[PDB]
Write a protein that binds this ligand. Sequence first.
Ligand code: SAH
Ligand code: ZN
Ligand code: ZN
Ligand code: ZN
Ligand code: ZN
Ligand code: ZN
Ligand code: ZN
Lengths: 417, 100, 67, 86, 59, 346
Amino acid sequence: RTRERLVYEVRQKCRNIEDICISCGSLNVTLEHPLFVGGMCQNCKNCFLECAYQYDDDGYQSYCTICCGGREVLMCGNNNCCRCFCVECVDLLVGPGAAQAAIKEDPWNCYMCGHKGTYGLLRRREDWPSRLQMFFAKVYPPVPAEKRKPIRVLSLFDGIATGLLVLKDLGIQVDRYIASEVCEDSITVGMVRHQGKIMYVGDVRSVTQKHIQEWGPFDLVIGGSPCNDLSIVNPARKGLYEGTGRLFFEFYRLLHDARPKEGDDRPFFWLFENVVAMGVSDKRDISRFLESNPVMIDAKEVSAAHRARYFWGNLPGMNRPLASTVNDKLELQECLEHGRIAKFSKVRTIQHFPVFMNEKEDILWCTEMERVFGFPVHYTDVSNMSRLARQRLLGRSWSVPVIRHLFAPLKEYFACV
Amino acid sequence: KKPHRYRPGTVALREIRRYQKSTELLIRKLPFQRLVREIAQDFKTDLRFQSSAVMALQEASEAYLVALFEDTNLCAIHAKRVTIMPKDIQLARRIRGERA
Amino acid sequence: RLVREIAQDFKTDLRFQSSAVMALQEASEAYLVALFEDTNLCAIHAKRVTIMPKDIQLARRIRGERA
Amino acid sequence: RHRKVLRDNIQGITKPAIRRLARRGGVKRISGLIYEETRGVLKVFLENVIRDAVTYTEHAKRKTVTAMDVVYALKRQGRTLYGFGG
Amino acid sequence: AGNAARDNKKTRIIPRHLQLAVRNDEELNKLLGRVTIAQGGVLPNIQSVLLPKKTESSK
Amino acid sequence: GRDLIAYEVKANQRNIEDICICCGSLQVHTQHPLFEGGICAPCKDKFLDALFLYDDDGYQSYCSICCSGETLLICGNPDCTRCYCFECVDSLVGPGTSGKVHAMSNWVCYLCLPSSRSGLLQRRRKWRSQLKAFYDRESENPLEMFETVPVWRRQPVRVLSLFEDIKKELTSLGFLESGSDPGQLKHVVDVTDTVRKDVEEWGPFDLVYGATPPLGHTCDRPPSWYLFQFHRLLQYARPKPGSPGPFFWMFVDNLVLNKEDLDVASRFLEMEPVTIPDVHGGSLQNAVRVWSNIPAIRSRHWALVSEEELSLLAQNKQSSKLAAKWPTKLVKNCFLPLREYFKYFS
DNA sequence: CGCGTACGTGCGTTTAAGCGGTGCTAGAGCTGTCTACGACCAATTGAGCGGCCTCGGCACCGGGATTCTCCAGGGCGGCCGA
DNA sequence: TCGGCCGCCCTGGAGAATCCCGGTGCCGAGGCCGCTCAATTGGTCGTAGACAGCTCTAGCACCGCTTAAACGCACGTACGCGC
Ligand SMILES: Nc1ncnc2c1ncn2[C@@H]1O[C@H](CSCC[C@H](N)C(=O)O)[C@@H](O)[C@H]1O
Ligand SMILES: [Zn+2]
Ligand SMILES: [Zn+2]
Ligand SMILES: [Zn+2]
Ligand SMILES: [Zn+2]
Ligand SMILES: [Zn+2]
Ligand SMILES: [Zn+2]
């Protein structure tokens, strides 16, 4: 109401659109809107952190990209776009009745996609990916090669031992690989694929500082806590402080136990992963506890999956843009087997059945999902585990080439094959 | 499977929450008044009562019965049951020392 | 000695008449015999012949002495 | 000063004493955890009665607890004792 | 009773408020044990055995 | 035989290590932790147990030196928590002196006096490390043991209170100086935006206290939050590894965390909780669980206190919530062993 | 109805309650003096209760959020006994 | 051989009831006023009680025998409890 009245003074050439917060109409303009012309208040910036990369079960965004609220949104018809625009924002910044006019357009393109750049009072700056990139963005020296040693890796909430597989693919010599896990299927996977070399512990809630000390020094501590109780798109979520969210704190403890003391300058590195859909207070508390700001890395650059994840850690050069390698499969069609056709160009895991086979809507294959996530083929085919269990295992797992990108400079710090 | 139906635990416990959170009288006023008059017929013929006297009798009688069903429910729980029985009321009144 | 120990918390340097201690002992033994009668009724009501601390707690709850 | 603090006299109430008080109460079979609970209940009962009787002695400006103060302390708690003067 | 009235979002003490005020306190309940307050009711206190088990099996 | 142990040293020319100074016995298992001399095995076992045990009535339930129940006196200088029996004082320094000591409440005890040689008492230099070795040999449990802080090398306590204020308590307990506000306690209601840089700016901390909300659920934030933030800021406030500095902590739960959160807290704080019941007013009043690394805090829990009765009290308190004060007085006592670590304001 | 544990029974030990003396002394109990504290009575007034009034705190009505409650279902699956 | 049936997890969706939120209305409580009788003040007696003194009763303390009973250990079968 008040915001709508203000926008009146904006179009009467009495107020600059760049001087008003186009999300909620607050006067406390501090930052500029990264996607379009206008200002942004701090409160809306926090809302913008949570809501932009939230997707519903249909594979489209949960909320409007502009105001990061809205009660009824317009979905986008154009290929590979997942954005939504709430009716209210469209009926202000573009013009009155433009929203219902977009409702009636059966082949409709949203304003983020359409070829033209000017749309009424709404203007889109062309540098929005780079500004968005920067918006979401004790140093050890290099060790000389002869002094390099095999890496020792602790992987908490190890899952299917993706980290050891990545280090093997990079040809780094692994002295030992200790892994905490509770799911029998996931325990089996590591044993088989890595030939018994993986020391399986059990419940991470049994792991003491004494255990960590007597297991010998660790060179790399890695992990991803369960995201079911952190991800905001779960209505029944218990947050960071209840249910399975609190396993992150156990990770924080064992990382603290595994970190060298001050004055001991031996090389040590860590990587923690979580979903982008994590709450403002949850994300803030995690970011404060790990004493760093997260780097946001999207799988779509190197892994042909729309999987935007936060990575806390101290791996060197982890800000540098992702450079694809020829080995990597940037296309979903370059991962499916012959006779199957990809609906979309990227799979969505944070149409429901993204396969066209024999003019029929088929579901995603487990092995094709393996190839998408960058795992060497038939990695999770070890025991007599259900399709549901293998799907859940691949879903919770890391994107392999993203982990290869992050782990890549560790080759300059430990012994290589 | 169109008409909805609850469980025997649910509706009973909702009634327990409803009648614990309320204060009003549960016995009807006129049958309780006829009961008080018929009991008073034996001790003296042709009484008269005040409305406040009958309401005071009803307040004290309902409070006495609610405390009695509290001890009755404890006696029922102690015998590994949930259903109260006349054994429970006789036990509660025999431990209160009122069997005379 | 139990009566003197319990009395030492309320007042120091007390002094008991022998008849007072005998009256306390009469009253306390009669109270415990009545309590074991209600405890025996609570034991029989639970289809048992063995009294348990549940029976003493139930007897002192129905009497109104959990206060 | 010249008064040793009496202690652990709740164990002066022996197991056969509570056994005989359960025999007079008509109890056929006594469990092992009866005795601690019975000592606790007898201790709380003596606490209440002596808490009244010492206050009756206090107001009388004496230092001797009489049998009459015990009878007054029990008759106040609705347990009228006979044989000691009402 | 003024605390019990403020909890119930009321600025007038009804006998329900005196009932909750006396019976929640332990020393006032010891003082007024054998005392009935008219139009009081009882305390909202349900035993922990008559409720259905709203739990989940860990295995 | 208590006037004989003052005769075996002076006349027979024997070593104090060769006589049990506790019960007068001639059989010596080990060497006494606080002073030079020997201790028989039962007195040794009981002496260790007595330190763990916490008494509401006095600084020590049973006597320090010989572990007797009665004949307890209070230390004169209020910055000391030591308590000795009358029979130890009579037997060692001489008859008719215990009465003189007990007669005043301002009589300087043996550890506060400039000279520690009274006539039959010998102090130990850097005794706390030897004391840790004493716990290591027989106590079967290596409980968290920070070096003791001498009176001469004493520091003003730097306190960080999270989610609950204790300035009134510590002021009543003599940890914070009244009248003068240099700011040796910082109360921080909101800590979501606290950073290591902030804590470094706030000055180095020696004691960080946290506590759960009171039973009236004042705030609409899950109670585990207090625990987890307490752990985080705790780790931040720990001194740089390889530094002789005391760091104490204590997280207190007034039965607001269920068994899940209880095990979680017990795991992070790496010990079992401490359940404390309050003075019965007929049946049971309220109770509180406490994690800490402060000496004689783990043994404060009383085995008589059951879980089911505690669950019932919790559910009668949570639903009723008549009183809504944080039980400051309940958790007030538990800091009492800490008295010998920081300066006391009378 | 099955199982197992824990309580009653019995015998040998030893712990101390009970009884019978003495002592002494703290303290209950009685008696004598007296004085200050409360009953009684007269004056007098202002605080407390009957009566009036007016107005807002709460009872009731109506609508939306919501929130536990009950049941369908996917799948699954294997397994299984038909 | 081989296809069709009961736990298990997981999940949530209709759905009847309940909590919250407003809107209206009413009657009961808060506040004002007269008045009148009970609270107050002043004074006076009379005896209840405070206090000194004496005495002499019983209460506490100690000690030494003496068995009565409390304790401790084995053991086995009857009852508590789970199904
Ligand atoms: N309490 C616990 N203790 C140990 N592991 C647990 C756990 N709770 C959940 N987990 C495991 O931790 C995993 C976190 S999902 C992360 C999987 C892993 N990062 C990967 O790349 O495969 C889950 O698969 C779950 O099986
Ligand atoms: Zn804004
Ligand atoms: Zn919008
Ligand atoms: Zn689009
Ligand atoms: Zn000894
Ligand atoms: Zn001292
Ligand atoms: Zn001593």
